[PDB]
Design a protein around this motif. Structure first.
Motif, PDB file in Angstrom:
ATOM      1  N   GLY A 107       0.602  -1.339   0.360  1.00 16.98           N
ATOM      2  CA  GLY A 107      -0.342  -0.203   0.099  1.00 16.98           C
ATOM      3  C   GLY A 107       0.914   1.432  -0.165  1.00 16.98           C
ATOM      4  O   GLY A 107       0.623   2.206   0.335  1.00 16.98           O
ATOM      5  N   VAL A 108       2.062   1.190  -0.488  1.00 19.10           N
ATOM      6  CA  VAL A 108       3.066   2.030  -0.092  1.00 19.10           C
ATOM      7  C   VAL A 108       2.162   3.410  -1.553  1.00 19.10           C
ATOM      8  O   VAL A 108       2.699   2.475  -2.732  1.00 19.10           O
ATOM      9  CB  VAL A 108       4.178   2.180   0.049  1.00 19.10           C
ATOM     10  N   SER A 109       2.363   4.243  -0.969  1.00 17.71           N
ATOM     11  CA  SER A 109       2.082   5.315  -2.278  1.00 17.71           C
ATOM     12  C   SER A 109       2.581   5.719  -3.662  1.00 17.71           C
ATOM     13  O   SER A 109       4.441   5.812  -3.229  1.00 17.71           O
ATOM     14  CB  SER A 109       1.570   6.625  -1.898  1.00 17.71           C
ATOM     15  N   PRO A 110       2.419   5.380  -4.612  1.00 15.99           N
ATOM     16  CA  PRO A 110       3.780   5.302  -5.832  1.00 15.99           C
ATOM     17  C   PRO A 110       3.937   6.704  -6.098  1.00 15.99           C
ATOM     18  O   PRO A 110       5.249   7.791  -6.708  1.00 15.99           O
ATOM     19  CB  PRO A 110       2.952   4.518  -7.578  1.00 15.99           C
ATOM     20  N   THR A 111       3.254   7.815  -5.874  1.00 15.52           N
ATOM     21  CA  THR A 111       3.106   9.234  -5.981  1.00 15.52           C
ATOM     22  C   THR A 111       3.180   9.696  -4.683  1.00 15.52           C
ATOM     23  O   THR A 111       3.470   9.319  -3.296  1.00 15.52           O
ATOM     24  CB  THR A 111       2.298  10.135  -6.420  1.00 15.52           C
ATOM     25  N   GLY A 112       4.254  11.145  -4.452  1.00 16.79           N
ATOM     26  CA  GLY A 112       4.772  11.678  -3.017  1.00 16.79           C
ATOM     27  C   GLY A 112       5.326  11.451  -2.370  1.00 16.79           C
ATOM     28  O   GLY A 112       5.402  12.223  -0.648  1.00 16.79           O
ATOM     29  N   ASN A 113       6.515  11.260  -2.820  1.00 16.80           N
ATOM     30  CA  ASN A 113       7.627  10.752  -1.972  1.00 16.80           C
ATOM     31  C   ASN A 113       8.931  11.757  -1.865  1.00 16.80           C
ATOM     32  O   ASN A 113       9.262  12.480  -3.147  1.00 16.80           O
ATOM     33  CB  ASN A 113       7.526   9.348  -2.538  1.00 16.80           C
ATOM     34  N   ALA A 114       9.806  11.032  -0.974  1.00 16.48           N
ATOM     35  CA  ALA A 114      11.247  12.281  -1.520  1.00 16.48           C
ATOM     36  C   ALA A 114      12.681  11.039  -1.699  1.00 16.48           C
ATOM     37  O   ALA A 114      12.052   9.566  -1.744  1.00 16.48           O
ATOM     38  CB  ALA A 114      11.896  12.246  -0.213  1.00 16.48           C
ATOM     39  N   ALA A 115      12.983  11.560  -3.019  1.00 14.71           N
ATOM     40  CA  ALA A 115      14.678  10.785  -3.393  1.00 14.71           C
ATOM     41  C   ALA A 115      15.754  11.493  -2.247  1.00 14.71           C
ATOM     42  O   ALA A 115      15.141  12.500  -3.042  1.00 14.71           O
ATOM     43  CB  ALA A 115      14.864  10.854  -5.425  1.00 14.71           C
ATOM     44  N   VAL A 116      16.622  10.393  -2.364  1.00 10.83           N
ATOM     45  CA  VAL A 116      18.223  11.220  -1.613  1.00 10.83           C
ATOM     46  C   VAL A 116      18.607  10.146  -1.884  1.00 10.83           C
ATOM     47  O   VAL A 116      19.084   9.397  -1.673  1.00 10.83           O
ATOM     48  CB  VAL A 116      17.503  10.794   0.186  1.00 10.83           C
ATOM     49  N   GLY A 117      19.698  10.962  -2.148  1.00  9.72           N
ATOM     50  CA  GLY A 117      20.796  10.261  -2.996  1.00  9.72           C
ATOM     51  C   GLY A 117      22.714  11.195  -2.443  1.00  9.72           C
ATOM     52  O   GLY A 117      21.958  12.342  -1.932  1.00  9.72           O
ATOM     53  N   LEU A 118      23.603  10.284  -2.372  1.00  9.45           N
ATOM     54  CA  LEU A 118      24.148  11.224  -2.188  1.00  9.45           C
ATOM     55  C   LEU A 118      25.642  10.545  -3.046  1.00  9.45           C
ATOM     56  O   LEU A 118      25.480   9.390  -4.325  1.00  9.45           O
ATOM     57  CB  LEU A 118      25.079  10.316  -0.482  1.00  9.45           C
ATOM     58  N   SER A 119      26.429  11.392  -2.924  1.00  9.03           N
ATOM     59  CA  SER A 119      27.836  10.914  -4.230  1.00  9.03           C
ATOM     60  C   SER A 119      27.404  11.194  -5.830  1.00  9.03           C
ATOM     61  O   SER A 119      26.626  11.934  -6.236  1.00  9.03           O
ATOM     62  CB  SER A 119      29.291   9.754  -3.798  1.00  9.03           C
ATOM     63  N   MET A 120      27.754   9.219  -6.295  1.00 10.95           N
ATOM     64  CA  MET A 120      26.507   9.106  -7.345  1.00 10.95           C
ATOM     65  C   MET A 120      25.274   9.064  -7.364  1.00 10.95           C
ATOM     66  O   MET A 120      24.338  10.196  -8.905  1.00 10.95           O
ATOM     67  CB  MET A 120      27.523   7.747  -7.662  1.00 10.95           C
ATOM     68  N   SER A 121      24.510   9.189  -6.749  1.00 10.68           N
ATOM     69  CA  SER A 121      23.816   9.481  -7.068  1.00 10.68           C
ATOM     70  C   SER A 121      22.450  10.197  -6.258  1.00 10.68           C
ATOM     71  O   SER A 121      21.033  10.426  -6.111  1.00 10.68           O
ATOM     72  CB  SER A 121      22.378   8.063  -5.945  1.00 10.68           C
ATOM     73  N   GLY A 122      23.551  11.740  -5.592  1.00  7.65           N
ATOM     74  CA  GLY A 122      23.123  12.727  -5.904  1.00  7.65           C
ATOM     75  C   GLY A 122      22.093  13.668  -6.459  1.00  7.65           C
ATOM     76  O   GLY A 122      20.986  14.048  -6.499  1.00  7.65           O
ATOM     77  N   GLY A 123      22.699  13.112  -7.355  1.00  3.91           N
ATOM     78  CA  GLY A 123      22.176  14.471  -9.025  1.00  3.91           C
ATOM     79  C   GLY A 123      21.107  12.893  -9.396  1.00  3.91           C
ATOM     80  O   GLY A 123      20.097  13.527  -9.819  1.00  3.91           O
ATOM     81  N   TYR A 138       9.504  16.266  -4.156  1.00  2.00           N
ATOM     82  CA  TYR A 138      10.818  16.357  -3.015  1.00  2.00           C
ATOM     83  C   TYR A 138      12.416  15.516  -3.599  1.00  2.00           C
ATOM     84  O   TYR A 138      12.004  14.006  -4.102  1.00  2.00           O
ATOM     85  CB  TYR A 138      11.119  15.810  -1.137  1.00  2.00           C
ATOM     86  N   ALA A 139      13.555  16.399  -3.279  1.00  2.00           N
ATOM     87  CA  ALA A 139      14.936  15.676  -3.109  1.00  2.00           C
ATOM     88  C   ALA A 139      15.533  15.930  -2.828  1.00  2.00           C
ATOM     89  O   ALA A 139      15.796  17.560  -3.084  1.00  2.00           O
ATOM     90  CB  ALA A 139      15.206  15.631  -5.535  1.00  2.00           C
ATOM     91  N   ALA A 140      16.350  15.373  -2.768  1.00  2.00           N
ATOM     92  CA  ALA A 140      17.925  15.905  -2.055  1.00  2.00           C
ATOM     93  C   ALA A 140      19.624  15.253  -2.184  1.00  2.00           C
ATOM     94  O   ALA A 140      19.149  13.700  -2.785  1.00  2.00           O
ATOM     95  CB  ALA A 140      17.954  15.240  -0.250  1.00  2.00           C
ATOM     96  N   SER A 141      20.009  16.084  -2.846  1.00  2.00           N
ATOM     97  CA  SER A 141      21.594  15.341  -3.231  1.00  2.00           C
ATOM     98  C   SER A 141      22.615  16.127  -2.579  1.00  2.00           C
ATOM     99  O   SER A 141      23.074  17.012  -1.584  1.00  2.00           O
ATOM    100  CB  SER A 141      21.688  16.058  -4.265  1.00  2.00           C
ATOM    101  N   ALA A 260      18.864  16.237   9.511  1.00  3.66           N
ATOM    102  CA  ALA A 260      18.588  17.874   9.359  1.00  3.66           C
ATOM    103  C   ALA A 260      17.363  17.764   8.054  1.00  3.66           C
ATOM    104  O   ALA A 260      16.488  18.725   8.624  1.00  3.66           O
ATOM    105  CB  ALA A 260      19.325  18.892   8.920  1.00  3.66           C
ATOM    106  N   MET A 261      17.068  16.979   7.474  1.00  6.19           N
ATOM    107  CA  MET A 261      15.620  17.572   6.871  1.00  6.19           C
ATOM    108  C   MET A 261      14.887  16.820   7.228  1.00  6.19           C
ATOM    109  O   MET A 261      13.340  16.814   6.287  1.00  6.19           O
ATOM    110  CB  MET A 261      16.311  16.917   4.860  1.00  6.19           C
ATOM    111  N   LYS A 262      15.262  16.282   7.492  1.00  8.67           N
ATOM    112  CA  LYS A 262      13.778  14.972   8.186  1.00  8.67           C
ATOM    113  C   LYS A 262      12.539  15.691   8.271  1.00  8.67           C
ATOM    114  O   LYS A 262      11.215  15.501   7.947  1.00  8.67           O
ATOM    115  CB  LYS A 262      13.871  14.616   9.412  1.00  8.67           C
ATOM    116  N   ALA A 263      12.451  17.290   9.457  1.00  5.87           N
ATOM    117  CA  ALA A 263      11.117  17.800   9.477  1.00  5.87           C
ATOM    118  C   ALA A 263      11.426  18.387   7.752  1.00  5.87           C
ATOM    119  O   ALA A 263       9.557  18.534   7.819  1.00  5.87           O
ATOM    120  CB  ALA A 263      11.848  18.528  10.917  1.00  5.87           C
ATOM    121  N   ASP A 264      11.965  19.097   7.569  1.00  4.17           N
ATOM    122  CA  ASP A 264      11.646  19.258   6.068  1.00  4.17           C
ATOM    123  C   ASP A 264      11.026  18.426   4.938  1.00  4.17           C
ATOM    124  O   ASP A 264       9.857  18.570   4.191  1.00  4.17           O
ATOM    125  CB  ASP A 264      13.120  19.127   5.291  1.00  4.17           C
ATOM    126  N   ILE A 265      11.081  16.949   4.758  1.00  2.70           N
ATOM    127  CA  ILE A 265      10.269  16.512   4.415  1.00  2.70           C
ATOM    128  C   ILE A 265       8.933  15.616   5.214  1.00  2.70           C
ATOM    129  O   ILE A 265       8.428  15.967   4.386  1.00  2.70           O
ATOM    130  CB  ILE A 265      11.447  14.812   3.918  1.00  2.70           C
TER     131      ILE A 265
END
Length: 271
Positions: A107-123, A138-141, A260-265
């Motif tokens: 039941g996880v929604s396919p929409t309304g999510n956040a993508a968070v990546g680092l190094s290679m996956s930041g972009g 929402y996206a974090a690099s 730090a970004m948890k409240a933001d998300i």
């Protein structure tokens, strides 16, 4: 902690993809791995307390496992040299196959999510938001390659990929003149991020986690500054830019940013 390990079939890659998962809400944080992604566990779970930090946050946490040097993209062909016997199709997996499976079974929604990546996956995170805004508002690099098609970056990315499992950037996006390089360049896709009103969180560290370290540091500094300036110039109004002097390109500081970004998300995704 109610953490699960799942086997999610990928039709496009002809194999099962392991996924570490923690529930707790209909919307999810997709935590993407770095360049040296292993096939047993995601780097976030190896190196950080991410699952515990987001436990009872009202958000699910998804950690896909695997995809060393993949840039979480759909490749042109199997990598030439290291004997890869299939083509990476990680954009197809993250945007179609995996969300379908999680929706149907959990039941996880396919929409309304956040993508968070680092190094290679930041972009990667920014590119996924650029082209799939309904899935990723929402996206974090974190220490991402923000301008992979420009200047020194196609060469440096090629070198990094070869050093990480012997993967071939030409098999991924072609020669640097190929349209795939600009297509997958966050800097180039800033107008999409602005048009979509994507909430972006962009962190860059300093220092050193061949070519002299100070030269590489200078390239990283300039490209990060250019991205921030271009986002503002192009009408961007929904970004957080964190460039603390003492920040590093390391799991401890990538975790600091994830916390730090948890409240933001929470506020962006769940009101």
């Amino acid at each position: 902690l109610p953490v699960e390990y799942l086997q999610v079939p990928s039709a496009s890659m002809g194999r099962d993809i392991k996924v570490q998962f923690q529930g707790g809400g209909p919307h999810a944080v997709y935590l993407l791995d770095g360049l040296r992604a292993q096939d047993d566990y995601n780097g976030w779970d190896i190196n950080t307390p991410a699952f515990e930090e987001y436990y009872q946050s009202g958000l699910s946490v998804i950690m896909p496992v695997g995809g060393q040097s993949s840039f979480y993209t759909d490749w042109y062909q199997p990598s030439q040299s290291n004997g890869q016997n299939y083509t990476y199709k990680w954009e197809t997996f993250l945007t179609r196959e995996m969300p379908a499976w999680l929706q149907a079974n959990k039941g996880v929604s396919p929409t309304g999510n956040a993508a968070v990546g680092l190094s290679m996956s930041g972009g990667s995170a920014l590119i996924l938001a650029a082209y799939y805004p309904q899935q990723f508002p929402y996206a974090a690099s974190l220490s991402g390659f923000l301008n992979p098609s420009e200047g020194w970056w196609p060469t440096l990315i090629g070198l990094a990929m070869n050093d990480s499992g012997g993967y071939n950037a030409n098999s991924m996006w072609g020669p640097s003149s190929d349209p795939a390089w600009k297509r997958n360049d966050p800097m180039v896709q800033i107008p999409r991020l602005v048009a979509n009103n994507t909430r972006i969180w962009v962190y860059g560290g300093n220092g050193t986690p061949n070519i002299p370290a100070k030269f590489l540091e200078g390239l990283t500094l300039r490209t990060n500054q250019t991205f921030r300036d271009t986002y503002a110039a192009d009408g961007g109004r929904n970004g957080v830019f964190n460039f603390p002097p003492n920040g590093t390109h390391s799991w401890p500081y990538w975790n600091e940013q994830l916390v730090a970004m948890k409240a933001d998300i929470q506020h962006v995704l769940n009101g």
